[PDB]
Amino acid sequence: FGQLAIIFLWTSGNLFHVAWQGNFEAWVQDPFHVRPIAHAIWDPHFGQP
Amino acid sequence: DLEDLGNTTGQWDSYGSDAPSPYNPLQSKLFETFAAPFTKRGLLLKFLILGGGSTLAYLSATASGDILP
Numbered sequence: 208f209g210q211l212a213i214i215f216l217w218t219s220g221n222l223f224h225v226a227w228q229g230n231f232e233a234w235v236q237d238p239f240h241v242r243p244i245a246h247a248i249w250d251p252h253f254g255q256p
Numbered sequence: 257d258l259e260d261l262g263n264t265t266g267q268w269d270s271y272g273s274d275a276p277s278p279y280n281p282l283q284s285k286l287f288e289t290f291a292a293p294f295t296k297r298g299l300l301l302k303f304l305i306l307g308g309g310s311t312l313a314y315l316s317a318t319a320s321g322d323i324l325p
């Protein structure tokens with residue numbers, strides 16, 4: 208019951224690292240095999256590249 | 257049997273231990289409290305852990321202008 212429980216904190220965020228960012232309102236507009244997004248990477252190690 | 261550096265010589269003798277150095281730089285209690293927060297503690301150390309680590313991390317990142325990755 209500590210199960211089901213952790214499956215929804217997964218699912219919630221699955222739907223919540225979507226819809227401030229990473230399209231729908233471009234992917235529905237009509238979605239051609241380019242690269243629709245889950246989430247935003249943020250690592251300090253990154254270069255500009 | 258003259259030569260031998262007749263008990264040569266000894267030391268007192270080959271002891272060492274009993275006073276080899278005056279111990280320590282004066283500083284007596286030039287600190288004593290002086291800074292307490294580890295000199296106070298009972299009880300602390302969380303308190304500090306959220307503080308130090310909250311700045312380090314908080315300003316450690318955010319802003320001013322990017323300078324980005």
Ligand code: CLA
Binds near residue numbers: 248249250252
């Ligand atoms: C060698 C290291 C270096 C380091 C230190 C990092 C570090 C990081 N990279 Mg990264 N990266 C690197 C090289 C590196 N990268 C390289 C060469 C590339 C290829 C270009 C990338 C490509 C890349 C991408 C695309 C992303 C990152 C992301 C990240 C961050 C993960 C964010 C996160 O949720 O917290 C760290 C991880 C966690 C908090 C959870 C991870 C789960 C692991 C640790 C399992 C252990 C948990 C265990 C089961 C529970 C008990 C353990 C206990 C200790 C609690 C992290 C800061 C990502 C990011 O910023 O996400 C938001 C993003 O995905 N990197």
Ligand SMILES: CCCCCCCCCCCCO[C@H]1O[C@H](CO)[C@@H](O[C@H]2O[C@H](CO)[C@@H](O)[C@H](O)[C@H]2O)[C@H](O)[C@H]1O
């Ligand atoms: C068996 C032990 C070794 C040999 C026998 C006994 C030695 C130890 C006990 C005797 C004490 C030594 O003799 C001496 O002690 C102190 C030296 O610090 C002195 O009292 C002392 O107080 C100050 C404390 O900073 C010292 O720096 C002064 O040099 C000193 O006057 C006494 O003037 C004298 O009694």
